[PDB]
Amino acid sequence: MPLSQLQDYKPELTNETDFDLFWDNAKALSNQKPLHAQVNLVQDYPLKSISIYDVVYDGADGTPIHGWYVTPKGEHQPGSLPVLVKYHGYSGNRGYPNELLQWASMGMAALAIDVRGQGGVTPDRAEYPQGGIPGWMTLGILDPASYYYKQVYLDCIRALDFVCSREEVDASRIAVYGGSQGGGLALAAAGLDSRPKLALPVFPFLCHFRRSVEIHASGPYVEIKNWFRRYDPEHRQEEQVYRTLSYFDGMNMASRIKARTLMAITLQDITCPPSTCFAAYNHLAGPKEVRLYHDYGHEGLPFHEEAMMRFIEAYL
Amino acid sequence: MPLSQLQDYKPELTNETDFDLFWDNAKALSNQKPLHAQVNLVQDYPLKSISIYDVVYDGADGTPIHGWYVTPKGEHQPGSLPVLVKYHGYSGNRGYPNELLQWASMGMAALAIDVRGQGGVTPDRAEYPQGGIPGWMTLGILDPASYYYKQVYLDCIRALDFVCSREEVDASRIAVYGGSQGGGLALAAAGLDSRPKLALPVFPFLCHFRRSVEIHASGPYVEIKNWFRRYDPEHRQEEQVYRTLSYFDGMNMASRIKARTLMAITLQDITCPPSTCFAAYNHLAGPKEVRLYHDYGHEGLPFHEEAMMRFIEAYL
Amino acid sequence: MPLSQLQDYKPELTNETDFDLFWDNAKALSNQKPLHAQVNLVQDYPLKSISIYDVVYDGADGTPIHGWYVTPKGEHQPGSLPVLVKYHGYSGNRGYPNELLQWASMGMAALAIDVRGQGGVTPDRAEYPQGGIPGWMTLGILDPASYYYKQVYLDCIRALDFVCSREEVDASRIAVYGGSQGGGLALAAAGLDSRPKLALPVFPFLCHFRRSVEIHASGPYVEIKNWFRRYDPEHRQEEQVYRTLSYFDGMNMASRIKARTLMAITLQDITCPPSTCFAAYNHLAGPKEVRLYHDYGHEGLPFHEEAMMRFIEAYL
Amino acid sequence: MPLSQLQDYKPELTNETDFDLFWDNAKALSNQKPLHAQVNLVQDYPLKSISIYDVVYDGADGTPIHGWYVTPKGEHQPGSLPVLVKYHGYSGNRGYPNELLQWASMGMAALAIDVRGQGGVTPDRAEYPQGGIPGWMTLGILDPASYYYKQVYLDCIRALDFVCSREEVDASRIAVYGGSQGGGLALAAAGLDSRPKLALPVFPFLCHFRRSVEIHASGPYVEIKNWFRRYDPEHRQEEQVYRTLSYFDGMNMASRIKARTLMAITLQDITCPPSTCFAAYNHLAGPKEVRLYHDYGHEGLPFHEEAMMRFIEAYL
Amino acid sequence: MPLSQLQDYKPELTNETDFDLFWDNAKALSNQKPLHAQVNLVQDYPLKSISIYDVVYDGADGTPIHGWYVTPKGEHQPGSLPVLVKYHGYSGNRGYPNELLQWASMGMAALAIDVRGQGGVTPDRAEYPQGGIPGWMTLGILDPASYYYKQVYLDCIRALDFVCSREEVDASRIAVYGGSQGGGLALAAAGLDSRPKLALPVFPFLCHFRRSVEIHASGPYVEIKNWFRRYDPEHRQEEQVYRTLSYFDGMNMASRIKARTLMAITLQDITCPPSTCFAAYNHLAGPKEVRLYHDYGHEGLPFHEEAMMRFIEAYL
Amino acid sequence: MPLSQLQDYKPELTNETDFDLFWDNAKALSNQKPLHAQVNLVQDYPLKSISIYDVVYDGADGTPIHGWYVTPKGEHQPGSLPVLVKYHGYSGNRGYPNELLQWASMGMAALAIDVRGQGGVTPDRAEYPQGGIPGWMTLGILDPASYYYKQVYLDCIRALDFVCSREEVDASRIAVYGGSQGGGLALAAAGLDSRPKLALPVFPFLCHFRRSVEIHASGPYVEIKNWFRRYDPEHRQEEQVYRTLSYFDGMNMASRIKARTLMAITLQDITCPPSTCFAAYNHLAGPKEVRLYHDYGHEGLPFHEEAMMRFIEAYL
Ligand SMILES: [Zn+2]
Ligand SMILES: [Zn+2]
Ligand SMILES: [Zn+2]
Ligand SMILES: [Zn+2]
Ligand SMILES: [Zn+2]
Ligand SMILES: [Zn+2]
């Protein structure tokens, strides 16, 4: 897709008429299950200008979700610290505490959590009706009530609960952030919950699934293709598959975001094609900015750090 | 490693002292769990020379294992039919019933089963303490009691319980067969159970783990290397990782096989490298024969089918 | 080409006005040359349900063409058995007798032949006026009377004469099938001869030659571009190259097919692109069905075996 | 090379008798050229807990070398701040000020400089006798006095003079750090200068040149091979090429390092192969530690940040 | 862009209003530096049929440009000999004198020169305000006056002055030739100077710069993309970049060429895309002819030698 | 293999006892069959310093062999011109008359011929008993009397009868030259016939077949490996295959060469590996010289032309 085409690219929403009903039912599941947040301070870490906490809280179905919570060292009044909540890339994990340093040295608290079952210490306790393709995208794909990303989305909202359980945190100054899957999950946390003030998705995955699969996006979108290869080579269940996926689709989530958003889009990206990123961005309901990186694909953006900082200082 | 060294290659066993104890505990756990076999005749399949059953039995933890059970059509006396159990490759499934025809046309019954959680309708109900690398090789890798392949090997022994429960089947004429993961599973079945008379591993996976990994074998062995990359970059838990895997290592299973064995090894194979295949082959306790395909890798072997037919006709 | 355009794609036929006269003359060559069939029962083969014959008969120019002819065991009444003729892929051969087991267990005969000069025991005794590119697609390319595929199309017709010469065979129940080049040869056999009742081409090669070269199909179509590279850099003989190949083109054959046809088309195929396959399917002159496999390329299709067996049970 | 041998690989020093005399003459010539340091406070950076200066100093031939110099915010006591000098990888640059954040938040000053002529605003004003291969590895390669890395190794040392000219900086607590080319530059700086107290090379480039080229390392070592291709196909000038490179070789620089060294070595690295890194490590004249990452090549080492930081805290 | 559109493709010229004034200011400053042309006869080169000279003249900034100059043997009259000047590919050099033998066996003189800085003995003495990407495409890119190909273009013209100052040579029968980079230089040579009678560009590089970058052409055009990556990720300096490059574009030069031009264009070339070559061709102002090699990419064209010889004989 | 042991690598000759008898017999038949050479002068070729002839002679089995025969223009005394015979690379052809110009300008006659069946107008009249792999390496491989290179070798010896039958040629000053397959044919022409004075093989193909195959050389040796994949997966026919190829092997030919030889060997060559070329070099019987190009693979060698020209001046 050429560029002035991408910038007006606004395909029709795929949300089923029961989208909000499905979600507030899923949120009722979460409301009945307490956080039971365990927070243990790490004192053997060499950075020293920040406080580092090892965190675990219960997901809606009892899965213990692990994170790192970091603050500036020193005394903080109740409701004084802004907070950034960071979600991570497909197969990754909470990372190391020092990657939250930038946020803490701006005066902010920050949280990085594991996505259940991925390459960390957080397991996946949900049960699925059938097997799948290596990875997570195809687990429970035939029914949205059992789909892998239902409990993931709920784990991501309960991270906002954890931050607001801390009295030093200012609940009116929450940003959600992430690259790729991380960016998908920030769109969903800002789409499903009212509390986030800013969203900063970078090349978000989990957007416009039908198109992503159709144009042979690389990376984890190929799992959905491999699903059809093994389960349904004539595409007879195609409709059930894309219907299930519509409830988690970032484009549908974007139509319900009122938070101010800064999106980063990379024009040579073949894992999260920019037409899927622009699909979501142009359905954003609140004010928004975009950074277009013409010659970058799915990879590190060291220059984007400073743009995110400016944005946060201006509006958080 | 050159061919004449391949066949003198007999590295030390890595079985811990309690290998047999770990397994007969896991087996006694399976012995308390009835199979609850359900069978259902497929009506209107194009082949009318065979009867085809859609089959489900419970694993030891209650997971419903699906399969296909195929016999020559018509009457058979109790205890008359020899039987072949087929196990499938990594990520695959029970396949299609026409792939078991060959066996039925030789007057045999045959069963193919799903491996739990892979590309089939058979899910994985076991719980793991942590997440993992996409795939199944790293689930529960820190403790053999909770490791993925524990319940897989038990499902595979329970496939022998299923075929032995068929009244038409002759329980003294059972063969176990599979390629790659399939071949590893057939060495497990024959290693952990006395009933199989023949074992037909094709390029068996799950053999000589520490060598597979260190010589940088491609395919699923790479998940173990990626475990290290994410969880343990200085290899401080390498000892626990390879002691977990030793309980499941086909080289240690081979040492308890008394069945007559026909192994295929492909000399250009970078996925199940031939030194790891030879290492298990050179520890087989019973009679054995090998087919060496010099210019083939990890790929379909059209000529091998005939070689297995002759072996089966001669000895089963 | 996008799926909705693909299905309606029906380009102009390239057949020259003397297309049927050429083939009439080429068939008169075949009429001069008797078969001299030799049939020899294969002994000690492990499948005892079937009788397997090792077969040779002469091509029109005298080339000994070898095959496997397989029947159900025991005697059969004159004219009783339906028969399947199998043609193989580019560089392949007659295969192994066990690959025709499925047809015998359905109560049918079957025949698999070598294509002349390819990777079996059947040489190519035709003489060509010039050299060529490695392979067979460019031999004699400047004159259809001397082109590689004339004597090949005639050996394919003579395979049908071989089967009708068998006492047990029913001439009114002949099917022809094959994949890739075999699919092309099946199209040729049904379009040039009236005897075949069914045709089952899978992603057929030798279709819409000028398109297949122009869009840069991989695999053997590349030999034609290489021909221009070596013999005709400026495309001065372009019109004569495409004229020669128009006489062998499956799209032209398909317009003369009255047999009922089941075609498989793989949508990601880059060796036999689907626009070229559909170009033939949409010129077929008899009843037709298509199976379209969205996420497969040029590869094995284990699900298609059952679709073919059903088609043959229904219609042969 | 297998691991235990690799850990003890200590090949013979290639330094000419000349080596210290050559560098004595090059350094004396540099000391005739004032620094002419210019420093400009960056305003309107979003962080605010650090002071950020845009920095330029003269190289020994007048080239204006650019950098970022970063301190914790506020005034500091004379001679109080430890300092980290970071040199960058092949083709890169001084990066972004936020990348020096972690050093500053430990109480340290930090300087990141451009390597002359590579991907930043610092040109290269040195003149060379011939042309060369794209890149910088082959510029002046027939004469050590005109070789690209002579003015580069002097620019790096003059970075130590710029930090020492800052009143806040403690000259007895200097650490030199870098990855790849930067690891190479760090070994040179610590080897040709007596001021660095710590060296932290990550998979250093510019070590054991003759072995690097002849085991066909990837990356910029390829430029040297291409030099032979273009200028000397039969290797008649090879002894002059390797004599030149010997004055720059990290292994020869290591035998002159008395500073305490922490080296990161990647085992699968094919750009800076592990034998070349180990050759240097085993010639280091001071106290040393190694981190050996088995499953990592030429890539980011995020776990390594924590290890450098603990090392800086115990010893800087 | 398909074949019939390619041929008519005549995009708008990008030359700025001051294009002619940029170039007569660059020539003014070239005019003031005398050629200082020196020659030197090579002794026992094995071809005795030809006179072989090792040659050196000064570029406009005193860079000494080395060449091979070849004439038919013995002494010649004043003004008798026609002459062909050959420019070389990206990163290459003057070649070997045997490569000019064919032009000399036609009773011509021939000159092949090094392009400054590339893979020969000729250095580059121009100074640039910043660094660059490895290679030469990005040196001085922000400023037309400081751009790498300014002095290159001037050295290519002064090659003309060198041949025109040899007594044997006939200034009215000058041809300029070369492949890829050489093709672009030949374009610029015949477009900036009145003297060449014939131009023979082969798949010229340095043509239609914006298009070459935007369609992801391989080879050196990718350096301009890597420039934006490293220096300007949001393309805020896109305009100055392409402006600079417009002073050097073959398209703009070709407008001013009144000489007679034979252009080889390769339809599968991904380094020098046929659209950019046809853009330059359809802007030629004098007579022209084209050879369109359909199945050739960026490579040797042994058949094109004869065509160039025919064009020369007929018109030089 | 490392260079020191390459230079002393002289493995065992694989010639059978009947190697000389085989070739005695094939040459006796060849000697009974006249050449019936036709020779027609080419007109309107732009060069003029040369006389060019289109040539055709009969092979020993009746294939018409086509070539180009080139001399200095004008008349010449009987027996006065030395001659170079050029054989081409695999899939190639006689090339263009301008590529012989170099040899003509030295005062020589030059002949380039076609290899039967390859990318020219020369067909292949031989009959083979079986099929093969695409290309010509496998044709007739189970029997030396029918092997493809038997009649090629004889046609190469008949190129010498053709040049000796020309009045102007000096039969005592024949040189045979070629690269890759051409180098193999040069070695066979010098090993089978007594007339050539010089041999100039460049990276000879057709050497030490068993090694080349078993170390996985790319290019046409891969045909022999593909022969085992298709015909003989378990290598039951490996000694018949290598016995056939031993009759054609350049290493065995080299044992019988009396002529003076200049060999170019490329050290990074993966198509014609250097140990296979050294195996031949080290069995040469007469005097010899080598040029080792250390960083070159299977590609053009523009510096080698001059060294060959020096060799020919010195010794022809
Ligand atoms: Zn959707
Ligand atoms: Zn182990
Ligand atoms: Zn056509
Ligand atoms: Zn050295
Ligand atoms: Zn432009
Ligand atoms: Zn041999």
Side-chain angles (χ1 to χ4, degrees), chain C residues 102-133:
Chain C
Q102 61 207 325
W103 315 122
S105 67
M106 296 172 62
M108 307 194 302
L111 176 72
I113 61 170
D114 293 327
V115 174
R116 60 159 62 198
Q118 306 191 6
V121 302
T122 298
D124 180 15
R125 300 290 157 70
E127 293 294 353
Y128 305 98
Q130 294 189 22
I133 304 317

Side-chain angles (χ1 to χ4, degrees), chain D:
Chain D
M1 208 185 282
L3 185 45
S4 57
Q5 296 221 319
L6 191 79
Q7 290 166 339
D8 286 332
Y9 177 47
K10 185 173 181 179
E12 66 165 307
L13 295 180
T14 62
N15 49 196
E16 297 296 331
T17 289
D18 255 348
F19 180 106
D20 301 305
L21 305 180
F22 170 87
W23 280 113
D24 291 348
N25 290 324
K27 290 183 213 158
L29 219 200
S30 165
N31 298 332
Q32 257 36 55
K33 187 77 200 61
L35 231 39
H36 296 311
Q38 318 172 290
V39 198
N40 255 233
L41 191 60
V42 174
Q43 285 166 321
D44 269 13
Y45 201 76
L47 251 359
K48 307 300 182 203
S49 72
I50 58 191
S51 298
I52 296 168
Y53 305 79
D54 208 345
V55 162
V56 51
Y57 67 85
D58 283 3
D61 65 355
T63 300
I65 312 297
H66 302 253
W68 302 116
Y69 177 73
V70 182
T71 74
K73 77 181 203 238
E75 299 279 306
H76 306 270
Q77 296 294 326
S80 53
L81 295 184
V83 70
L84 182 128
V85 191
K86 167 173 188 199
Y87 307 103
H88 70 69
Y90 195 83
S91 89
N93 54 55
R94 68 172 174 169
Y96 298 106
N98 69 289
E99 305 169 55
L100 305 176
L101 178 63
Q102 71 181 302
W103 310 121
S105 74
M106 287 166 75
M108 298 183 70
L111 178 67
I113 57 162
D114 286 331
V115 178
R116 55 168 63 214
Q118 308 190 358
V121 301
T122 298
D124 171 23
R125 293 187 182 170
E127 296 297 2
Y128 303 103
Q130 300 191 342
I133 304 317
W136 306 281
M137 301 292 297
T138 69
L139 296 174
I141 203 181
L142 291 182
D143 178 30
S146 67
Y147 183 57
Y148 175 77
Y149 281 114
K150 207 193 88 191
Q151 293 283 335
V152 175
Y153 285 10
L154 305 172
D155 298 328
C156 297
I157 290 172
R158 292 168 70 92
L160 304 177
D161 307 339
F162 165 92
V163 301
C164 291
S165 77
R166 296 301 87 184
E167 186 80 357
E168 68 273 13
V169 158
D170 184 343
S172 76
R173 300 175 73 204
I174 296 167
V176 289
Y177 158 62
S180 202
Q181 174 179 251
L185 295 178
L187 293 177
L192 293 177
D193 204 73
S194 69
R195 288 169 296 184
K197 173 174 187 198
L198 265 31
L200 293 98
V202 177
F203 42 68
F205 184 58
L206 316 167
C207 291
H208 207 354
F209 283 112
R210 189 194 283 276
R211 187 184 170 78
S212 294
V213 174
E214 82 180 56
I215 68 175
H216 309 279
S218 308
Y221 287 131
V222 177
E223 290 175 38
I224 293 154
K225 170 180 75 72
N226 290 341
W227 192 87
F228 289 113
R229 286 176 61 89
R230 292 293 202 180
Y231 295 74
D232 184 28
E234 310 185 61
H235 286 212
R236 297 201 125 87
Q237 298 183 94
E238 106 171 335
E239 170 185 333
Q240 173 62 83
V241 167
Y242 291 123
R243 180 194 87 82
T244 286
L245 290 172
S246 76
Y247 296 90
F248 305 92
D249 192 317
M251 184 175 75
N252 297 324
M253 299 289 186
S255 63
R256 296 151 176 96
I257 294 158
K258 338 224 177 63
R260 183 191 294 272
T261 295
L262 173 66
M263 188 185 289
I265 297 180
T266 46
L267 245 159
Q268 309 311 312
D269 200 331
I270 69 187
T271 289
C272 299
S275 57
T276 60
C277 295
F278 265 105
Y281 177 85
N282 290 320
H283 279 289
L284 287 160
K288 64 194 161 146
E289 287 166 25
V290 72
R291 298 296 179 264
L292 242 149
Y293 300 120
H294 278 60
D295 325 284
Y296 277 92
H298 211 257
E299 54 189 314
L301 296 181
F303 41 91
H304 201 61
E305 299 267 50
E306 157 174 7
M308 294 196 292
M309 286 187 306
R310 293 177 180 289
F311 183 76
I312 283 167
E313 273 148 48
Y315 303 108
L316 189 54

Side-chain angles (χ1 to χ4, degrees), chain A:
Chain A
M1 194 155 265
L3 189 49
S4 36
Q5 272 263 271
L6 279 166
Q7 295 165 320
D8 306 341
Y9 184 55
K10 198 184 168 152
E12 189 193 78
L13 300 174
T14 64
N15 53 202
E16 296 286 301
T17 53
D18 73 344
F19 186 94
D20 289 340
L21 183 51
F22 173 81
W23 282 111
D24 37 45
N25 286 337
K27 284 181 229 177
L29 285 185
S30 175
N31 296 345
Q32 292 161 40
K33 181 72 171 178
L35 253 68
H36 278 127
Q38 250 52 73
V39 174
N40 288 287
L41 180 83
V42 182
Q43 295 180 282
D44 272 356
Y45 203 77
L47 259 173
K48 299 322 192 204
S49 57
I50 65 188
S51 299
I52 298 157
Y53 305 83
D54 193 358
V55 170
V56 56
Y57 62 87
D58 287 1
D61 71 4
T63 304
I65 308 312
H66 298 257
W68 295 116
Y69 178 67
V70 166
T71 59
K73 65 150 82 139
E75 173 54 37
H76 315 293
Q77 287 185 71
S80 61
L81 302 173
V83 63
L84 224 190
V85 174
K86 179 176 171 203
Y87 305 117
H88 71 66
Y90 194 78
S91 84
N93 54 46
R94 66 182 169 158
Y96 304 92
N98 70 278
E99 316 175 57
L100 304 179
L101 181 65
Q102 55 199 321
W103 312 122
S105 73
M106 295 180 79
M108 305 180 63
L111 180 73
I113 58 162
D114 281 351
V115 172
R116 58 162 62 210
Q118 302 196 6
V121 303
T122 297
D124 183 2
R125 288 183 185 176
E127 295 286 16
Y128 305 105
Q130 309 188 349
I133 304 311
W136 306 278
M137 303 299 291
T138 75
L139 291 170
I141 197 148
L142 291 174
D143 184 345
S146 57
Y147 184 62
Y148 174 75
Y149 279 107
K150 197 193 88 176
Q151 289 282 341
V152 172
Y153 286 20
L154 301 176
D155 301 327
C156 294
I157 287 169
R158 299 167 69 83
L160 304 188
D161 295 341
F162 172 85
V163 297
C164 305
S165 80
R166 283 253 138 177
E167 54 164 357
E168 69 266 21
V169 164
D170 185 339
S172 74
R173 303 178 68 196
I174 301 159
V176 292
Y177 162 68
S180 188
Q181 173 176 257
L185 300 172
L187 286 181
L192 292 182
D193 196 275
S194 274
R195 285 169 291 186
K197 179 181 185 175
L198 308 173
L200 299 92
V202 167
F203 49 64
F205 176 62
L206 311 163
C207 293
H208 207 349
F209 285 103
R210 194 185 289 273
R211 186 180 176 76
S212 280
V213 171
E214 151 180 52
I215 73 183
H216 313 298
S218 280
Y221 289 120
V222 311
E223 289 182 37
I224 300 152
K225 190 198 74 213
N226 291 338
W227 196 87
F228 290 111
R229 286 169 62 93
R230 288 228 190 247
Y231 289 82
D232 180 35
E234 286 171 67
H235 288 212
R236 297 221 236 273
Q237 313 185 60
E238 150 276 308
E239 203 202 341
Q240 181 58 66
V241 162
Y242 295 114
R243 184 185 315 128
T244 296
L245 293 172
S246 73
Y247 294 98
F248 311 90
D249 191 313
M251 178 177 62
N252 302 326
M253 293 301 171
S255 68
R256 299 169 169 74
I257 292 178
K258 309 289 185 44
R260 180 184 302 273
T261 308
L262 173 70
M263 192 177 296
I265 295 163
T266 42
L267 292 202
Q268 304 312 317
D269 199 324
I270 50 167
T271 301
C272 300
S275 64
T276 61
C277 302
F278 267 107
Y281 174 81
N282 288 326
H283 270 295
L284 284 173
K288 54 179 169 168
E289 298 182 358
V290 61
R291 292 290 185 283
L292 232 84
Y293 297 124
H294 285 76
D295 314 288
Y296 280 84
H298 198 79
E299 60 182 310
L301 285 346
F303 37 84
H304 194 56
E305 263 56 22
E306 179 176 326
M308 297 194 287
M309 288 185 161
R310 272 176 218 292
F311 184 74
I312 284 163
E313 184 180 49
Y315 301 108
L316 186 50

Side-chain angles (χ1 to χ4, degrees), chain B residues 14 208-210 241-243 245-247 249 251-252:
Chain B
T14 62
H208 202 10
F209 283 109
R210 190 197 280 276
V241 171
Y242 294 111
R243 165 170 68 253
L245 295 169
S246 69
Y247 293 94
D249 197 307
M251 177 174 84
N252 299 324

Side-chain angles (χ1 to χ4, degrees), chain B residues 268 291-296 299 303, chain F residues 216 225 228-230 232-235:
Chain B
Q268 300 316 309
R291 300 294 174 269
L292 314 167
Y293 302 125
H294 297 69
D295 315 293
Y296 279 85
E299 45 178 311
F303 34 87
Chain F
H216 315 297
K225 180 210 81 185
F228 292 105
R229 286 170 66 83
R230 288 282 181 195
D232 184 29
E234 308 182 86
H235 287 214

Side-chain angles (χ1 to χ4, degrees), chain F residues 2 4 16 91 93 99 110 123 139 157 162 169 182-183 202 253 267 309:
Chain F
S4 171
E16 300 284 305
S91 79
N93 53 54
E99 308 168 53
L139 293 170
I157 285 161
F162 173 76
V169 173
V202 172
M253 296 300 172
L267 230 65
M309 289 172 146

